[PDB]
């Protein structure tokens, strides 16, 4: 069993305890840690933050304690225009240029693999995404010849039916990529005038419009398209999506007036770190879509949908029952890394819950 855990650069700058550095990551927790988002310039892979070489160093040092740990550098991200990927990958020149520039980067900085987080390729991009993957992987193979362990190659794919169907040639890309991460947590957003859970497990028998919008449908679908279960890792979010209620209505379908108030620490509308949610929860009312196996809280005109240890283990068993490669947790920085916000004196409570399940048979 795998546990792929992301670490995002921008989390350092958070204030108070919110600040987080690779420095605080428990070396034996996950099996794969992914530094989140490297840039691309002059078609070459490149750093982002002014101090990644430093933080790079600091994350890769964790392997001094856990030899089995592996680390990968992600490329792309949400604040990286999809166009920029498309532009690179449509002109063979740019593509190959980009590619031949990656292995040395990783070798130079201690990484064991590259991660492709091209956030949503288009209709016009499928044919080239297949290329990037192919060639990129061919290069990683030709470099093992130099007598070093072969660099890993993975990709974060959307879990949206349309999304996948629009820009993913799963069948192909699945046989090249060492593993595929399914972003099973973006099935809703403030862009929908009404309340909704973003990382539901099941379709839930009362609504029937977006059944394709749940981890189960996603998985079962990816399998159909051809991807094997030994390359699949299900995403598990460690944050929550919050809304500001446009009425006293709180039950399913209550109208939304817009995203939620920012977090003390995560400082950003619509989203909330687990540890922030832990504080929120106090004085809040907690419910749970028993149908879709996930909770939601409300306090005032603030409606929040999130994942708790329960819902998370729940999902964890799910992937075990479909025989998947492993689990993926989006944002360690978002978990209670210090373990002081969420009652129990446990560090990384959520990511642990999943580990403890996966550590089971
Ligand atoms: C991820 O990558 C991003 C793109 O590479 C990068 O953001 C950008 O990168 C550069 C800026 O560093 C940006 O370039 C310009 O934007 C300006 C307009 O707003 C233009 O004026 C500028 O045009 C020129 O480019 C020349 C250099 O590229 C510059 O010539 C010299 O450059 C030297 C210093 O830059 C200087 O020493 C020398 O004397 C030259 O003068 C020339 O003068 C002129 O100004 C660029 O178009 C990229 O376009 C922008 N990327 C895009 C496409 O949006 C991010 O920094 C990176 N992320 C992180 C955090 O690192």
What does this structure look like?
This protein has 2 domains: 1-238 and 307-361, Glycosidases (TIM Barrel, Alpha-Beta Barrel); 239-306, Chitinase A, domain 3 (Roll), CATH 3.10.50. Helix 10 runs parallel beside helix 11. The chain has helices at residues 52-60, 82-90, 92-100, 103-109, 126-144, 161-167, 170-174, 215-225, 274-280, 309-321, 349-358, and strands at residues 2-8, 32-41, 44-46, 70-76, 113-117, 152-158, 179-183, 232-237, 239-245, 256-259, 271-273, 285-289, 294-299, 302-306, 326-330. It is built from 11 helices and 15 strands. It is globular, with a radius of gyration of 20 Å. It has an 8-stranded parallel barrel with strand order 1-2-4-5-6-7-8-15, surrounded by 6 helices. Strands 9, 10, 11, 12, 13 and 14 form a 6-stranded antiparallel sheet that branches. The chain is α/β, with parallel strands linked by helices and 361 residues long. A hairpin with a 2-residue loop joins strand 13 and strand 14. Bound molecules: a molecule of 5 linked components (NAG-NDG-BMA-BMA-BMA). The site of a molecule of 5 linked components (NAG-NDG-BMA-BMA-BMA) has 3 residues, from strand 2.
């Amino acid at each position: 069993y795998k546990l792929i855990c992301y670490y995002t650069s921008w989390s350092q700058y958070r204030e108070g305890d919110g600040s987080c550095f690779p420095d605080a990551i428990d070396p034996f927790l996950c099996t794969h840690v992914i530094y989140s988002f490297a840039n691309i310039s002059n078609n070459e892979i490149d750093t982002w933050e002014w101090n990644d070489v430093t933080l790079y160093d600091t994350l890769n040092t964790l392997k001094n304690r856990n030899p089995k740990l592996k680390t990968l550098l992600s490329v792309g991200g949400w604040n990286f225009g999809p166009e920029r990927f498309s532009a690179i990958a449509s002109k063979t020149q740019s593509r190959r240029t980009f590619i031949k520039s990656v292995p040395p980067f990783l070798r130079t900085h201690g990484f064991d693999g590259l991660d492709l987080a091209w956030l949503y390729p288009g209709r016009r991009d499928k044919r080239h995404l297949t290329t990037l993957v192919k060639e990129m992987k061919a290069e990683f193979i030709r470099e093992a010849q130099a007598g070093t362990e072969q660099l890993l190659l993975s990709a974060a794919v959307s879990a949206g039916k349309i999304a996948i169907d629009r820009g993913y040639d799963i069948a192909q890309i699945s046989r090249h990529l060492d593993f595929i991460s399914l972003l099973t947590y973006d099935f809703h957003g403030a862009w929908r005038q009404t309340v909704g859970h973003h990382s539901p497990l099941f379709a839930g028998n009362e609504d029937a419009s977006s059944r394709f919008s749940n981890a189960d449908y996603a998985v079962s679908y990816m399998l159909r398209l051809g991807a094997p279960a030994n390359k699949l890792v299900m995403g598990i979010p460690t944050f929550g999506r919050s809304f500001t209620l446009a009425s006293s209505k709180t039950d399913v379908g209550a109208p939304v007036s817009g995203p939620g108030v920012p977090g003390r620490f995560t400082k950003e509308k619509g989203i909330l770190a687990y540890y922030e949610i832990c504080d929120f929860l106090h004085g809040a009312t907690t419910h749970r879509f028993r149908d879709q196996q996930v909770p939601y809280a409300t306090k005032g005109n603030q409606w929040v949908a999130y994942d708790d240890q329960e819902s998370v283990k729940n999902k964890a068993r799910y992937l075990k029952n479909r025989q998947l490669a492993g689990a993926m947790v989006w944002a360690l920085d978002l978990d209670d890394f210090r373990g002081t916000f969420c009652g129990q004196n446990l560090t990384f409570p959520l990511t642990s819950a999943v580990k403890d399940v996966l550590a089971e048979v």
